[PDB]
Amino acid sequence: KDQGNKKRQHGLEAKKSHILAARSVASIIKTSLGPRGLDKILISPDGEITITNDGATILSQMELDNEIAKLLVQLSKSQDDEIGDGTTGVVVLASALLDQALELIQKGIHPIKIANGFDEAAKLAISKLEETCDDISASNDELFRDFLLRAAKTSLGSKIVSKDHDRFAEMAVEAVINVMDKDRKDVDFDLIKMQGRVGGSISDSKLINGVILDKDFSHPQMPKCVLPKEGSDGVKLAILTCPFEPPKPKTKHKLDISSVEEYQKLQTYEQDKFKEMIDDVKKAGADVVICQWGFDDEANHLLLQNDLPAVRWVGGQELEHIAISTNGRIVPRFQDLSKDKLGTCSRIYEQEFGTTKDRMLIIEQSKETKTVTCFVRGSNKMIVDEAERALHDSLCVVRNLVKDSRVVYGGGAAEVTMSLAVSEEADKQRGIDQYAFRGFAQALDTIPMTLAENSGLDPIGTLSTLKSKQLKEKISNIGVDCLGYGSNDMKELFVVDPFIGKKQQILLATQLCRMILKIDNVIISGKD
Amino acid sequence: QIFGDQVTEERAENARLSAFVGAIAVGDLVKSTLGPKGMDKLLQSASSNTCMVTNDGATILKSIPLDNPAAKVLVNISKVQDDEVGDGTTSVTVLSAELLREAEKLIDQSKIHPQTIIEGYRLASAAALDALTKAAVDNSHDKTMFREDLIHIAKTTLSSKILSQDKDHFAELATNAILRLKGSTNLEHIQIIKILGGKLSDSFLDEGFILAKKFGNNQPKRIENAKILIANTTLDTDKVKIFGTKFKVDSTAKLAQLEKAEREKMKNKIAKISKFGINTFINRQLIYDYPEQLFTDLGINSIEHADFEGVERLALVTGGEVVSTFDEPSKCKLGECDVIEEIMLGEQPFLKFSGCKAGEACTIVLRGATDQTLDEAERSLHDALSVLSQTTKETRTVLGGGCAEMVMSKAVDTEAQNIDGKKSLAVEAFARALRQLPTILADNAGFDSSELVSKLRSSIYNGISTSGLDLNNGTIADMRQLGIVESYKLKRAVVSSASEAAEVLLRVDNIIRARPR
Amino acid sequence: NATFKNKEKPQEVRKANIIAARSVADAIRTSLGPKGMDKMIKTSRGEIIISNDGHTILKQMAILHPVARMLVEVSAAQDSEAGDGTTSVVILTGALLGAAERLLNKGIHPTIIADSFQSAAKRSVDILLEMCHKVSLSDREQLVRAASTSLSSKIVSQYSSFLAPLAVDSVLKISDENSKNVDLNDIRLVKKVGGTIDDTEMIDGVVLTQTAIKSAGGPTRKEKAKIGLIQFQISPPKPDTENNIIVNDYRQMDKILKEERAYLLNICKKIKKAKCNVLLIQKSILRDAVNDLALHFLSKLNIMVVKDIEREEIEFLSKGLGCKPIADIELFTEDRLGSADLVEEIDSDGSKIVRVTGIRNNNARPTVSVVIRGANNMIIDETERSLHDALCVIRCLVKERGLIAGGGAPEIEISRRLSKEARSMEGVQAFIWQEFASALEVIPTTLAENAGLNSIKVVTELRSKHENGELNDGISVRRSGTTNTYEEHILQPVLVSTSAITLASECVKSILRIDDIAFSR
Amino acid sequence: NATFKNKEKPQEVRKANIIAARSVADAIRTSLGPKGMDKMI
Fold this sequence. Notes:
This is part of a larger assembly, with 1 copy of chain A (528 residues), 1 copy of chain B (517 residues) and 2 copies of chain C. With 528 residues, chain A is an alpha+beta fold. Chain A has 16 helices and 16 strands. Chain A is elongated, with a radius of gyration of 29 Å. With 517 residues, chain B is an alpha/beta fold. Chain B folds into 3 domains: 261 residues, GROEL, domain 1, CATH 1.10.560.10; 122 residues, TCP-1-like chaperonin intermediate domain (GROEL, domain 2); 134 residues, GroEL (3-Layer(bba) Sandwich). In chain B, helix 1 crosses helix 3. Chain C folds into 3 domains: 255 residues, GROEL, domain 1 (Orthogonal Bundle), CATH 1.10.560.10; 105 residues, no CATH class; 161 residues, GroEL, CATH 3.50.7.10. Helix content of chain C is 47%, strand content 15%. Chain C has 16 helices and 18 strands. In chain C, strand 8, helix 9 and strand 9 form a beta-alpha-beta unit. Chains B and D meet through helix 5 and helix 15 of B and loops of D. Chain A: Pfam families: Cpn60_TCP1.
């Protein structure tokens, strides 16, 4: 099928071509590794120019015909959710592993043995990391919170928000606390909604304990706010999914009035339906009517006369958020609405951010809730995007830190320690295992060298000094000058990376290397 | 093949070559137009029926299409000059092009990532801006007339607002809140106190800094000779989230004991504060009874719930700092406050700070009838202060004819010596880029640019020299005697924009091809 | 010595611009003077145009080079201000461009060239104004003599004794004295077939080019009349969108006819109620200008009707009458109407021209409309051209009073004086002034070459003669040599030469100031 | 940071010489040992 314009490689150039393609893909974001990584210009087909050093963003927006590169990019897309901030490091490590595998194959080693040896080396490196890891939560709660805030600030400082990034870190920590419990120590990002718009400043960030529902209340005369009514039991919400209109035909409609009899009959039917719905709403005791669909003119008029602000076109996920925040339930229809299923919230009011005149509607609880929304604003679209990315990274880092008390330190110190351990263990295992361990150690050496290169330091001398310091004197956390630092020994600089994060990075790099190596034949057809 | 739609990443060598050379080439479109004696440029349309000749740099840049993405980025970054000043776009573009050319030359001499070049450019720009600020002069003589104009402007702005209840009083308050600062006029230096129990006409003026939400349970109501340091520590409600955690305890008593031990663990950090010579402590979060007693034993005042805006303003007025941990004793920056008093305004607690070290701030107390009146008064005061602040931005001028630019270049050269060798080259490159402007000005004037530039450099280097370029006689003359001056704001904005534009492109490694339009 | 390497050479753009401009100037130069050679330009439509007029040649040349179009712009400016000498300004621009090229070859920056040319032009203008023989607008004799001198170049010469005073009076009625610049475009030349050259009229008010209704009911005149400009037409309802008449009974047809007649009568009555005694209907091919029933209604209403009026006439009357146009009958009111003592059609020997006199309106101005009569179309065309030339000359006199000797005498004198004075200058300024003085002699050289005289000998003769006289001897085609132009009644307004110098200086400055060419779309 | 300009390109000549020497060495390599392959010239 589609034999014409079909290309394939197998037996001679498959391995070399795949490894070269992987190296070329890696070189796209290799220079962007680290906080001071060089930026790349990304331009949309419409001509919108953007600047960012995020490896995940760079790879996601890149399309290509190479099969190995496409597979690597697709795997990175899935890994972005698992870690997020480690995509570039994982890609670089996989590229280094493939480069070493090239030499190993040139020496006569079968790919399966290379993959098995890399897996064993990854296991040994993870064991070494676990042995050398330190516990923060088991030392002091104050120190644990300080390290959480420090990680959030470090993530935020790489963007424009660095001027006032403290507020973003505090909001992220509060959202994680509200949404995550210690039973599982996992943050449910589905309950942490990310929303924002162009305008305002970085100081307009706000954490909401419920859904936003920035709606216009349908009818122009419909009140735009639901007040607590001077100390009353908050605001009662009618969670409904049935549209606030009587059944209508789907074929003709055109229910026009031609005489008195037809007018009377149609008015009787429609008014009876609307009165039934509005009476059910009133009996339920709800103060605000929320429907998954829109509202009819008669329904809007009746709600306005009864002082019942309306919310139109609320999505299913929004309804679930309403139920979670207000401890309510979703009522399929008006006839099933009762006071026992209405949700309660502190208030539904309009909130202004900076100079914004939209006056968006927000549902606020002011109490601890299982679902929150992270609101992000900024003077430019780039500011908002960077703030959202930094908030996501901070949330992931906090989740990783809380999930596992064991942590490692950045700047390549963990990579250097793993490389030293793997090199030491290599001489103990005979056969192809020795070559595999040496290759894995050399690949691990790539990350600190790349970081040093990105920081303007000599990778050779920097790596040699790091190895000497970590071997001759003692095992510690010594890395490269990723940022402006007085000296080395990140341990005193408080550059901490979660242990689970590093373990996931290593495992994903090994898996990607195996996936690329295990493909010995590629076939691609033509295009129409 | 990568990406698509004619938008693909170029080879690293060619990508960097484009990023630098194409961006620099944008200056050539407007370099000839620099200065009043600049040349004219012809822009020809495809039909040739709408061609026109103009010497405006902004028009030339916005009219001529730029296919190279680097040129697009450079122009987009330089566009900030039009909004900030509305003039001098040609100077911004020329300075950015010269900085990029110097950075390219440095890279050709190093072949290393320009991050060190970026840092050197940042340092040189900071030094040049400091020198420019030092070289500026004030034309705000007869400050009484300026005060009268400010009063009139305030009265004009207060019209149709809630503050119209006492127009003269509020105009005087607004004028004072800007004039008495003797420095930055930003709203962060002006505090507004909103309380109920009176009329807006009864507003009081307080030069001191006032905060709300008084602190302490057993703390004194008066603090003298305070040594203020701000920290962000969780001294209250530790272990915020514990639901779902399994505790190896027989009863809740042991869990409470574990929490008490965790709270006690903070005693080391609490004690470390005393080693800094600190007698006043400010914490962003609340402070529990145990840490409060620990501070009391050390004789340190404990201030609670300082939040962020309060912390920032208190540090700014007292010149302090905010930290999260105490790594080493005796290593920190401490603020000072002569007297701190606990006061209540409108049945609401407040903290009064007096004698702040070099404090430059003012406070206005509003006595309203409801929330709407107080909010409207605050917004009207903010608008009036923003309008009045214009007087503190004008009248600031620097010597023209390249004198200020040459002084800035000399300052940068001086900075090039008290710096590491790996950055002295970048500092010298920034100085050369600054010096390029007078050379282009002389070239556009039709005179021997080299001779004039060398003479100006020698004169400026040789002490208290106010000489500059004489584009009318083609010689060197004293700018101060001739009264040739240029706006300080314009020069500062141009230099800052050029530095930012250079930094934007320096950090770029590769550039993706722009999609043709 | 050594200069900048200049890997990129913006000077190439300036060289190309100078080459193109000098080529255009040389092409236009050969047409200078009455003996100038004719130029042939074939249009893209196949029409062949032969003429020695610089304006027409430049327009038909279809110059594509953007910079060379500066010469066309200079010619247009000269026509607007001076009205003559479009060849001289181009020749001067070419000479200045050549001088600038020579200066650049010497290592002089273009900006200094422009500044020194500006200074030299200022000095030359001052020198020219010094030697000008002043005249007074109140002295009709001098203006009549100047007009006759200008008209002598036309076929109609023996009748110049009437054409000259006609234009003199027409201009004086609106310029008086000490009025600075006066625009002659407000003077309208109305041509009518019939009569002879001697048949002419000025009409201090305004003259319409259309006759009154010759059918029944046409008053042909009306005293105490108000004149308004009507853009609509008097016709039954004519919607611009889809429309039709539906009839289902004889009564319906009668009702429709009565409605149409009532609409016409109502339109006429609305026109009358505004007190518009003179109706000026714009020409239209979609709606009848004035229906027969409308004509009868207007006649019964004592309203003068003039139709078949073109847009140009309406635009002219907008200033001549001082009134405003009426978009539709709904906006037809008295405020949109003018005034006049009487409006009537004048028919002395078949003239049949409607005139408006005694407007007495503040907005209205005495836009004298000279009536041109003649049995043959050629007579009226030549009279119009001759009167236009006379009006241009009189305008040149009004803006700057006085005349100067023709034949290049002022050019030679100014060149000699500037050359003598530049010896006291120092630096690049002296060289540029010497080059400017040398270039100034282009005009006399071109005149000598076009006249078939020895080019070099004529310049020497003029220079030698100027050592004794002053603005008296120059090149005259009548004597085929150098003679006393002042005694030969060969005089030209000083404004022509002053504007030529100023425009040449501005054009050379603009050309030299262009240093690069870029595309913008 | 700043390092040597390296305006010249001796690397091309050095690499060409290294390539030639390595080619000769590879040609001679297969003759090592008692079981070395014979070479015919």
